[PDB]
């Protein structure tokens, strides 16, 4: 009955292209060629912060939108003060695999993870004044390619064993494990009412889940290589991704389906990162030719360039009041653009 | 100026200076090694007298040193079979040492595409390749039993002759010669197609009872660095 | 969507011939370098062929090697693996895979157990 189900799957797939078909009456492009374009935009390196010996591999910022955090292959994670470029901490990491890194909302706790397969949390309001090993949330099976923090007792962290896991802080467990990936997942994006959540993974394919019902709800489509980059729009009703293709996508949760491709026949290099304006017209890149673009997300258009970094850039993010957009790379130096 | 900014100043001098210490140290003629191979493959028994295991999760590293300079080997053994994504972090590792199962010839393909892919990567296309072929000794007994042909797996093995720059020790048989320089040249023919000249293969034959892996490694690094600094200083 | 179908296959005699073409949609073929990969009753994937962007720089399996012949033809977003001569040693499910990232000269996991870019798979039987 193999043969059957397969035909079956087929048909469902048919029914489900030909729905979203029919639900595109039209395109974004044309539907907004006649708004304003922002003009060019130009960004200017703020603060460098300067600090690190290794390459940067990833980088969170704070809800107050002064404190980040930085990931470093020399087994650092250092909390920065960007306002005045003062090191508030120094936690030395035991694995220098380190691929990911977060900053609660709360911030007292920050986490990071890697090819240690192991999510670490850290506390940094500790009444010792020791940045401490709270806990070590061990299970998955691949290395850890992202993790959010929900609350300040739940994170979510994506793996390479094509899984997406929730965790309880206090008890150390998988509270729900999210399944369906036939590729390495590589990033993840919390929604803004932290219910639902996205994961690109390594088989072109973004999938929304349910936090609560741990199922998946929607799959999007569109890519045509490894996914390492995704994020919500503000709205949360869509979300751009980044692939190895040199390609980014913006799929819309509602409608089912992909509403714009920001590619250029120029662009050759994969996306390594990319986030969203406060208003979410501006949609900022970092690709692996050592720059960063920062595209019109209504229309598409290439606004501006973030030039300036020696090295990769690995990993890019925006404060939550958009002041300031913070990127990192291989040069070991994280800048701040403004 | 205010109390807590010269607070918060002096945190951050005591954090750099504490950092700048700990890079200093354990990090000064440290080089790291990316370990690589099969299941058949003996990569774990590659260094002998040092071996060490380190495993907790996922990830074992063994730690040497040859003439006051210590290396790190790392070898990732808990992942998926999927690595594209993973082998990108290794960028920094000075040489990458390959180990390859010479005796079996059946996935002696499947090692040579692996070598191909990670020389061509973009990633790894800086990085030197140290190449161990092990079980010369197993090598050896196949090809003296003769009930395995290598030409059904390899055709142009038919066409082949052991170069003049081969030197064979005196109780290795022709035959044997001629197939291990064979697989070695395979392997080299990979490396030369596409070697952008800032990254080399040094092929190594060896054995499990071989104890000269850690010297190997050792020349093998100060020539990699080497032809680093000489290409930096406009010298080659 | 990324989806890749096969064609041809079925019971042939030793020494007959097959056309294996596969199908690609949804990407771009130029840009990507195409694989054939088969799995034996019992044994893991083994690369059968590779072709590269141009069609110009071709590899083979040292088992294979003389026999099967690779062709990709980019205007009709098709791949095809003639084999010539084939014997009953041949007998496995063959599947198409590009290669993960496009531009590229390397192919990492082609024939890993889980492959996102693989086929469905043709049954080629030789009695």
């Known amino acids: 009955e193999l043969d059957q189900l397969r035909q079956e799957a087929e048909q469902l797939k048919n029914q489900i292209r030909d729905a979203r078909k029919a639900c595109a009456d039209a395109t974004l492009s044309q539907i907004t060629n006649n708004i304003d374009p922002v003009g060019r935009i130009q960004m200017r390196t703020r603060r460098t912060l300067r600090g690190h010996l290794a390459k940067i591999y990833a980088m969170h910022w704070g809800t107050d939108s002064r404190l980040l955090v930085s990931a470093s292959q020399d087994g650092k994670l250092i909390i920065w003060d960007s306002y005045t470029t003062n090191k508030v901490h120094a936690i030395p990491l035991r694995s220098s695999w380190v691929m990911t890194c977060a900053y609660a909302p709360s911030g007292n706790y920050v986490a990071c993870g890697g090819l240690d397969n192991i999510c670490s949390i850290y506390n940094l309001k500790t009444r010792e004044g020791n940045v401490r090993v709270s806990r070590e949330l061990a299970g998955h099976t691949g290395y850890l390619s992202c993790c959010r923090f929900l609350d300040d007792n739940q994170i979510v962290t994506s793996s390479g064993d094509t899984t997406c896991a929730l965790w309880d802080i206090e008890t150390g467990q998988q509270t729900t494990t999210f399944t369906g990936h036939t590729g390495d997942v590589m990033s993840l994006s919390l929604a803004p009412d932290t219910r639902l959540f996205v994961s690109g993974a390594c088989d072109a394919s973004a999938k929304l889940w349910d936090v609560r019902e741990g199922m998946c709800r929607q799959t999007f489509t569109g890519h045509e290589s490894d996914i390492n980059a995704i994020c919500f729009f503000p709205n949360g009703n869509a979300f751009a991704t980044g692939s190895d293709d040199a390609t980014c996508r913006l799929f819309d949760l509602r409608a089912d389906q992909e509403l714009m491709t920001y590619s250029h026949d120029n662009i050759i290099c994969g996306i390594t990162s990319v986030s969203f304006s406060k208003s979410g017209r501006l949609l900022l890149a970092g690709y692996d030719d050592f720059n960063c673009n920062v595209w019109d997300a209504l229309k598409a258009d290439r606004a501006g360039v973030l030039a300036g970094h020696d090295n990769r850039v690995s990993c890019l993010g925006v404060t939550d009041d958009g002041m300031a957009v913070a990127t990192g790379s291989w040069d070991s130096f994280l800048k701040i653009w403004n | 100026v205010s109390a807590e900014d010269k607070a918060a100043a002096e945190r951050s001098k005591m954090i750099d200076k504490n950092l700048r210490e700990d890079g200093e140290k354990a990090a000064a003629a440290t080089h790291r090694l990316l370990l690589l191979g099969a299941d058949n493959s003996g990569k774990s028994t590659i260094v002998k007298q040092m071996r060490i295991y380190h495993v907790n999760s996922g990830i074992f590293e063994t730690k040497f040193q040859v003439d006051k300079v210590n290396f790190h080997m790392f070898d990732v053994g808990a992942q998926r079979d999927e690595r594209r994504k993973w082998i990108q972090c290794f960028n920094d590792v000075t040489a990458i040492i390959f180990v390859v199962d010479s005796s079996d010839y059946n996935r002696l393909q499947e090692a040579l595409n692996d070598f191909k892919s990670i020389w061509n990567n973009r990633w790894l296309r800086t990085i030197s390749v140290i190449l161990f072929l092990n079980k010369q000794d197993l090598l050896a007994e196949k090809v003296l039993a003769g009930k395995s042909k290598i030409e059904d797996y390899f055709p142009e093995f038919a066409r082949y002759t052991t170069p003049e720059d081969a030197t064979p020790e005196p109780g290795e048989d022709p035959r044997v010669t001629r197939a291990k320089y064979f697989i070695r040249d395979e392997f080299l023919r990979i490396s030369t197609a596409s070697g952008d000249g800032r990254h080399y293969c040094y092929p190594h034959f060896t054995c499990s009872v071989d104890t000269e892996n850690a010297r190997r490694i050792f020349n093998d690094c100060r020539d990699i660095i080497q032809r680093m600094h000489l290409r930096q200083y406009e010298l080659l | 969507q990324v989806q890749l179908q096969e064609s041809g296959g079925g019971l042939v005699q030793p020494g007959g011939s097959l056309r294996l073409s596969c199908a690609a949609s949804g990407f771009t073929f130029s840009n990507y370098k195409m694989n054939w990969v088969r799995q034996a009753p019992g044994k893991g994937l083994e690369w059968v062929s590779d072709?590269?962007?141009?069609?110009?720089?071709?590899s083979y399996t040292g088992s294979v090697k003389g026999r099967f012949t690779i062709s990709r033809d980019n205007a009709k977003n098709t791949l095809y693996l003639q084999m010539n001569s084939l014997k009953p040693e041949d007998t496995a499910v063959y599947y198409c895979?590009?290669?993960?990232?496009?531009?590229?000269?390397?192919?990492?996991?082609?024939?890993?157990?889980?492959?996102?870019?693989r086929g469905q798979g043709t049954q080629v039987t030789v009695s």
């Open positions: 072709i590269s962007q141009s069609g110009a720089s071709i």
């Open positions: 895979a590009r290669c993960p990232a496009p531009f590229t000269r390397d192919c990492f996991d082609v024939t890993s157990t889980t492959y996102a870019y």
